[PDB]
Amino acid sequence: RHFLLMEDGEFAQSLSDMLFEKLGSGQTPSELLNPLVLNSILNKALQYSLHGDSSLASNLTFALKYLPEVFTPTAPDALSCLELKYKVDWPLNIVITDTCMNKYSRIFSFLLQLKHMVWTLRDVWFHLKRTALVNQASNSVQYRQLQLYRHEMQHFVKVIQGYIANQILHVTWCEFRNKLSAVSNLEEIYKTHADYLNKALFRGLLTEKAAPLMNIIHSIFSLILKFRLQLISNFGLMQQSYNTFKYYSDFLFEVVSKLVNRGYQPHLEDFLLRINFNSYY
Amino acid sequence: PREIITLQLGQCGNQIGFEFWKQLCAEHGISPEGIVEEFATEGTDRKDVFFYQADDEHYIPRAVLLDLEPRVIHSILNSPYANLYNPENIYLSEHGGGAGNNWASGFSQGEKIHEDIFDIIDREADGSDSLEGFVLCHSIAGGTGSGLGSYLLERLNDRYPKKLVQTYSVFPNQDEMSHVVVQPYNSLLTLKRLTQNADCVVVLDNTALNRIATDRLHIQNPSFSQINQLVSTIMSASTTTLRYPGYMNNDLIGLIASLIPTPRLHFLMTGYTPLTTDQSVASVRKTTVLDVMRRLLQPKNVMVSTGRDRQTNHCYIAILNIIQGEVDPTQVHKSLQRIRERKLANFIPWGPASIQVALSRKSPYLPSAHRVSGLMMANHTNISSLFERTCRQYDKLRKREAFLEQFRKEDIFKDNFDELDNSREIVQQLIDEYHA
Amino acid sequence: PREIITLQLGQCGNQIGFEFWKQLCAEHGISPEGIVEEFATEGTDRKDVFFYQADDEHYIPRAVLLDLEPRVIHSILNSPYANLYNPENIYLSEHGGGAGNNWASGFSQGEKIHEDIFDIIDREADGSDSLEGFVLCHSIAGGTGSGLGSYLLERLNDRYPKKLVQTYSVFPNQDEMSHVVVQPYNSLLTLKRLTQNADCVVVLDNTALNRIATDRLHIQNPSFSQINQLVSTIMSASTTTLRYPGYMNNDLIGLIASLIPTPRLHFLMTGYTPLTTDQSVASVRKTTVLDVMRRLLQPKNVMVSTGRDRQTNHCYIAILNIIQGEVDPTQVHKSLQRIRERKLANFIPWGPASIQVALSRKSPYLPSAHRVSGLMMANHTNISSLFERTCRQYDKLRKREAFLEQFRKEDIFKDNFDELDNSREIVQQLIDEYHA
Amino acid sequence: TELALSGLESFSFDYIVKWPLSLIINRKALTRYQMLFRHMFYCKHVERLLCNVWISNSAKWFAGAFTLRQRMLNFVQNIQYYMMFEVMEPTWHILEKNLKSASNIDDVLSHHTSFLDNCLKDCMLTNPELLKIFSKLMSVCVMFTNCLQRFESTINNFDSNFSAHLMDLLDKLSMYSTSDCEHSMINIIYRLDFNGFY
């Protein structure tokens, strides 16, 4: 619970510092020595916030995948190409199967990309610290409507993840431990733990792996690079970047409405909160 | 690696952090230098983050306490917490200067103690893994705490231009003028630093403290001396995503980032519900979480002076609802489902607003680990009602004749009074302009 | 046959060595007139190096205590260490000589007590099968230890040319010059002899001793007799890898060779953390291996006076980090992993550097077999700050026209004043030049 | 395995043992153990001989000599001393637990020789090419130790043999990186590389 769902969120916090050695790829070393020096500093990153010591953080191991992020030259990433691999070893592997490890790499990888959005948005908040690396609090040479479109951006991301965090944690932790344990007769757990794992990813987002909700999270990422690259460094190019975001959110609203059936995935209920928001103005 | 240096400064600023550090040993249920329970490591899964870990059998606060009266920090010596603080590392035990009460005394005393004041917060960080920021726990009340603390709101965002500024400003009683009579002056000077030499602020009104102390804690005897008790409770509430883990917004700059639309708006109204005493005769049968966020979208906890027809002529723009500890975390999303049907939420009459809910655990400590706890860190556009209160008590003082010359006895010998007035009406108006 | 004759010489230098010798009996746990324990060969696995090589069946100290003041050798018998020393080599029952206070008085008294001073250390280094060297335990303070001591660095350097030379330099107090004024002359005179007739130094500033004596011991006011406690400890601490097991370069000519990059870059900064009373009671309950040897890589324990902006604008080239007693030695390389994550120490990248870590199993004694002690032997290239301290006080005094014919009353009848300024300026550029 | 070989240095011992401790420690196992002696027997003679050239010693050859001995001793000390020091203390500890645990005298021998082939491999990879790089490192202190007893142009012969082993450890660094990428000996020799880093 502590290292994939991040209820020891101090690890995902330390990840934000590792992600402050990224800012997209490639530009980071590529060696076979690159996982060799990187699997060490991630196991140490639990100690980096000064928690515990390695002997419950050796159940977690990392296998760095190589993919072209220069888009033909190989240069690997820690957004979706850095994967947690849980161990197979003699004491626990009554719960461990190779199928359930496939989905441990998927949850740990799904968290990491949305977390790189949230982190880099706060790299912008350090940029604009005032006296006077901010320059300008309103018009002229714009900050007024710039920051108006910025705040409806960080509305939407902080309240999307907020709804996603609550379906991720609460029923899954009640479903798992209590039930499994209480039903006592324990045999052949990996057919139940995988049924549990299959309900747990239903709760995450799921998107049936094909549907334009998956196209809008891809596409709002493509504007997010334009937001960090312009603010780190064009004012017409700023406002276009969020006009495309407003295209993508209004595209999302019509999709919620064709998903509405009568009850169909716990994200739907939480989405109709925002729908009635849209009705209120 | 999110080490924060608290810069407790002033007569009240030393008191609200005196009771903040004292709140942490009692909520972790241990000795402030020992361990006498196992709730310290099991409850708090990051025991050092505002402390450092043991190597002498004693806890180490990341605190500095400077003021212009040596009396307040000797009233920290008198109290038996000299085995939680160090009177040669954590405070200067007898630090003098001004009388003081002038804002201009301490503003000129930070610039002749300029060499020493950044080798005590940068000597307070010296085994740190990496700095998050600074919290300026300073006082607006008096000219002492306000005087030197307003210089550090500037020099800490350009000697460290990537570190956090956020202030616990506490005002002097606005039902007096006989406590401090330079009060409209020392308020507005700092409010110029609050909109353009800052980032986010926490402004805490004092008369709304005493409005709650007789209506939710029901003491008969409303005085200016409950100033530090209600404040030290919301201070320890605000950092349950850094001293106990979070999930999303697992940093403090996570919460604070999403409650700032534009510079000049970031003045957060703070609310904290567990002060009710009729929720505690019904804690055996577990009180409900279905009506405890109808106190964060309806007034019942505001420490911000705001009107009653300004909760409708202004709406929430960003609202954060931090649930803590035991809370029954499987129906907090069911509670947020029934908000939209009544319409207790308020949204701007144009575009996006957002009701963020997040959750976090806590250590054993029954008022928020056995009872539902609701913290609101709101962002309402109704914050101009106070900026009209401070401007209307400021120009009122100039028809009385006072501190047009009695302010210029040290430092100030040039006119800049209608310069603080002009920037303030620019602030109050662009906020109303920013919405339809 | 790694025999060292320590030459305790000088008034302050006899006392830093007195309590040095009272420590070795306490850790071998024997009565000082025999070996009365069997811990003498099993616990301490060496029976000679500061003992005479047997021919009587006893181990006598290889010590000489020469002074011109009989007050130091008469303070032998106010303690029961007058049946450990023997009167014919280690002292001479009553020995007079000059007051002397002037360097050039004792320097010519070396040249007529040339017969006894080179036949008193050879009537005790006439059981050795090959001499390791001479450590000159001599003070720079006073004109007695400094006058004779600049002479012996020349003559043991032309009749023993492959012998290890190493001094425990202790300075005179520099923050009192209201009782002394010959202080920049006699200090710099020894230092000229240290950068070309010597190979290694250990520089120990006296005001940087007394920094720690008010920041770890907490006495009302440091004075001679409270200064022998910090110096004597670091001596018995340097031979904890020469007397107790090591393996590779655990001879004295292995460690000391690796802390010298080149002649004139050998000035070693010393740090010693455990004197405090609440860090001495944290090792009974064990402090972690991940904080007791990274605190020897944190600069806050230095016995050299320097700035804190030069510990980050200059980098280590050779650093030794001796942990004693408890260590838990299977995480000592885990501790060495973490140097790169905190970055408290900075390291040369133009050329090779060395972070030497060592551990040793000590003989029974509760202050060291159950207590973690950390001895630092740095080589940091901000030693030029001391050389500015002595040159800026030298040139100021010769313009007040003092010691230009009042220091020449004994054996000096030539010009040598710009000879002392030029050699100090040679040392300060050739250190800094050696590392980019 | 071929590293450690008979030259002018080929020093061992033959430990006198008798039954029933003679099958605790096989003499065939002692031949397996005396080569791990031998690997540490060369690198302390390296390391002690760089002390002995330092104590045997501005002018022209003198100033260059302090920089080549200071750079040569840190080359010997960062690979040899550190990797041995992180070896000898955990290996004493993993042997005291196989010591006590045994209900037979061929159990402690099997638990000693399945210990012993791990210790060889992580400290020395099987290939003659690490030999080649140890001796060149050793030949520069060999040009040194005679030249401090003989009495310019002597320095540039030393500098050409200094550049010979520098190219070869870089070739050695490539031989570290084309190993398993899976077994902890690559994790051992990486930590070699970081000691030479600072």
Residue numbers in the entry:
A (entry chain L): 1400 to 1632, 1648 to 1695
B (entry chain l), C (entry chain m): 2 to 437
D (entry chain M): 605 to 661, 671 to 764, 821 to 867
Paper text:
To further support our assignment of NEDD1 and to gain high-resolution insights into the interaction of NEDD1 with the vertebrate γ-TuRC, we used X. laevis egg extract to purify γ-TuRCs for cryo-EM SPA analysis. We subjected the purified X. laevis γ-TuRCs to cryo-EM SPA and identified a subset of particles with stoichiometric NEDD1/N-GCP3/MZT1 grapnel density. Local resolution ranged from 3.9 Å in the core of the complex to 5-8 Å for the NEDD1 segment, where the resolution was initially limited by the plasticity of the NEDD1 segment with respect to the γ-TuRC core. Next, we performed molecular dynamics flexible fitting (MDFF)31 of the AlphaFold2 model into the consensus cryo-EM density, resulting only in minor changes. Cross-correlation analysis against atomic models for N-GCP5/MZT1 and N-GCP3/MZT1 modules indicated that the density segment on spoke 14 corresponds to the single N-GCP5/MZT1 module in the complex. Overall, this indicates that the NEDD1 tetramer interacts with the remaining four available N-GCP3/MZT1 modules. The NEDD1 grapnel interacts with the asymmetric side of the γ-TuRC through docking of the two proximal N-GCP3/MZT1 modules (p1, p2) to GCP5- and GCP6-specific extensions just N-terminal to the GRIP1 domains at spokes 10-12, respectively. Consistent with AlphaFold2 predictions of the interface, a helix-turn-loop structure specific to GCP5 inserts the conserved GCP5 residue Leu252 into a hydrophobic pocket formed by the N-GCP3/MZT1 module p2, which is supported by basic residues interacting with aromatic and acidic residues on GCP5. Similarly, a GCP6-specific helix extends onto the surface of the N-GCP3/MZT1 module p1, where the hydrophobic triad Leu333, Ile335 and Leu336 of GCP6 binds to hydrophobic patches on the N-GCP3/MZT1 module, as also supported by AlphaFold2 predictions. Moreover, the conformation of the γ-TuRC was not affected by the presence or absence of NEDD1, suggesting that NEDD1 binding does not activate the γ-TuRC for MT nucleation.
